[PDB]
Design a protein around this nucleic acid. Structure first.
Ligand SMILES: [K+]
Ligand SMILES: [K+]
Ligand SMILES: [K+]
Ligand SMILES: [Zn+2]
Lengths: 84, 177, 60, 115
RNA sequence: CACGUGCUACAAUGGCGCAUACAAAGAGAAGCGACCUCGCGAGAGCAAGCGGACCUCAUAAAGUGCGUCGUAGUCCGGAUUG
């Protein structure tokens, strides 16, 4: 995991968007490709659509989700089982 | 003895106030405690039932009564009159001594004890609980235990309802989650 | 009680770490030393997130 | 003899015997013994009841047995409820730490299941 | 799910603890980095030396002595998961 001294990593563009959305009010889901960005407390109650490589997957941030990367909640590979 | 003395000295007064009972006879009493072991494995081996009986005897302090199948059951591969369990009925002094031992020593010795369910009343004020391991009872020796045997304990009460039953047990500070 | 069919049942002294001593009838016969009892057991005594975690670890 | 609601082996040395407790490994076992002032080589049978009580106090400091199991269960449950990648791996009974699944992964998957 | 090539084991000709011997070959400047301090540790800070038979990587390990474990799914194994 990222060293504590470096602090949590977030893409600047996502941070700006989140701040604007929080200030604005309840907003349409934010569309981001930043799967690597850590989920922050301010994000809670916001819906962020995270790219999974082919589509943006809506994620409603919750308190438990905080401290996890956005990509964790958007699955990249599709598998419905062999011989299914 | 002590718990019986406690019942008369304290429990009656607390219950009388709580339920506004007209008479002392109205106050719920612990009629009996029945300890049962269902030894299905006995059908394969007779000795297992004997060992279970010996364990129940040590815990109860009383020789157990062997129970036998009421009717033949294909599912369990049992025929009527085949011994498949043992029980002891505890009354009076022996009951109160067991009740004390259970609350004071055995229940604490239960692994990962987080309290007993208060929803285990049968609807008529009688409380049933299961013991997963005979080890909890101090009389049983961990070193000499051939097999882990559980038992089911039922406390029969003169309580008309579950609320009266739970109150009676609560008065004795029976552990409840 | 019937005679000669029951286990011997005599008063024994049970001692605990908390120091509670109880004299009870039992088939055990020998005096018992107990790790725990009703008096000292945590349940009886009553002795028995992410947002906060984030703030503590990553306070800026 | 009886610590943390379990029976530790009397014949074994204390350092080994303590590891029988869930949540106690060799390191914690050594730490507990050092705090209790009991030598690692000493057998549990040899220890006095007072010595056993000191051990019990030391064990109480660490989360162990049922309490630990509850914590572990909650942590896994949280992940599965979250629906995070790790949670999904727990649900499917597949490796959670990015190991290969094309071959191996038998510990998580279990015995090979013929097509 | 099937196969190939490996690694680690299933222990006592071993495991673990402590103490203590004996190599070769090689690499290094957006590099090798000592010492000292700090951290259980991975490391961190500070900071020599060395473009090298000079300084650094860098500890050889098996071994040996002593102690312990005593044939157990173990003081074997170290997968898996928090
Ligand atoms: K352990
Ligand atoms: K993978
Ligand atoms: K390999
Ligand atoms: Zn006590």
């Amino acid at each position: 995991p990222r060293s504590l001294k470096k602090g949590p990593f977030i893409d600047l563009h996502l941070l700006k968007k989140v701040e604007k959305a929080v200030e604005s009010g309840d907003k349409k889901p934010l569309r981001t490709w930043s799967r690597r960005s850590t989920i922050f407390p301010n994000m809670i109650g916001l819906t962020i659509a995270v790219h999974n490589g082919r589509q943006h997957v809506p994620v409603f941030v919750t308190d438990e989700m905080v401290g996890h990367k956005l990509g964790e909640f958007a699955p990249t590979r599709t598998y419905r089982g062999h011989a299914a | 003895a002590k718990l019986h003395d406690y019942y008369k000295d304290e429990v009656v007064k607390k219950l009388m106030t709580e339920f506004n009972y007209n008479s002392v006879m109205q106050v719920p009493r612990v009629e009996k405690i029945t300890l049962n072991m269902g030894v299905g494995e006995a059908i394969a081996d007779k000795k297992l039932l004997d060992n279970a009986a010996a364990d129940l005897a040590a815990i109860s302090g009383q020789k157990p009564l062997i129970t036998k199948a009421r009717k033949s059951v294909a599912g369990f591969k049992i025929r009527q009159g085949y011994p498949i369990g043992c029980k002891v009925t505890l009354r009076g002094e022996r009951m109160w001594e067991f009740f004390e031992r259970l609350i004071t020593i055995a229940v604490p010795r239960i692994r990962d004890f987080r309290g007993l369910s208060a929803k285990s009343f049968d609807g008529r004020g009688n409380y049933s609980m299961g013991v997963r391991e005979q080890i909890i009872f101090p009389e049983i020796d961990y070193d000499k235990v051939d097999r882990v045997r559980g038992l089911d304990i039922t406390i029969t009460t003169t309580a008309k309802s579950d609320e009266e039953g739970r109150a009676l047990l609560a008065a004795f500070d029976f552990p409840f989650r | 009680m019937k005679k000669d069919i029951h286990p011997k049942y005599e008063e024994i002294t049970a001692s605990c770490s908390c120091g509670n001593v109880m004299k009870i009838r039992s088939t055990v016969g020998h005096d018992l030393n107990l790790d725990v009892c009703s008096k000292c057991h945590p349940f009886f005594t009553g002795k028995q997130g992410r947002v906060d975690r984030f703030n503590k670890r990553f306070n800026i | 003899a009886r610590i943390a609601g379990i029976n530790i082996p009397d014949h074994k040395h204390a350092v080994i015997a303590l590891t029988s407790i869930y949540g106690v490994g060799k390191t914690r076992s050594k730490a507990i013994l050092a705090a209790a002032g009991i030598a690692e080589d000493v057998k549990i049978s040899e220890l006095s009841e007072g010595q056993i009580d000191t051990l019990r106090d030391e064990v109480a400091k660490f989360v162990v047995e049922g309490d630990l199991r509850r914590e572990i269960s909650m942590s896994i449950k949280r992940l599965m409820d979250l629906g995070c990648y790790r949670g999904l791996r727990h649900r499917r009974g597949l490796p959670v730490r990015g190991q290969r699944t094309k071959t191996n992964a038998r510990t998580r998957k279990g015995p090979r299941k013929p097509i």
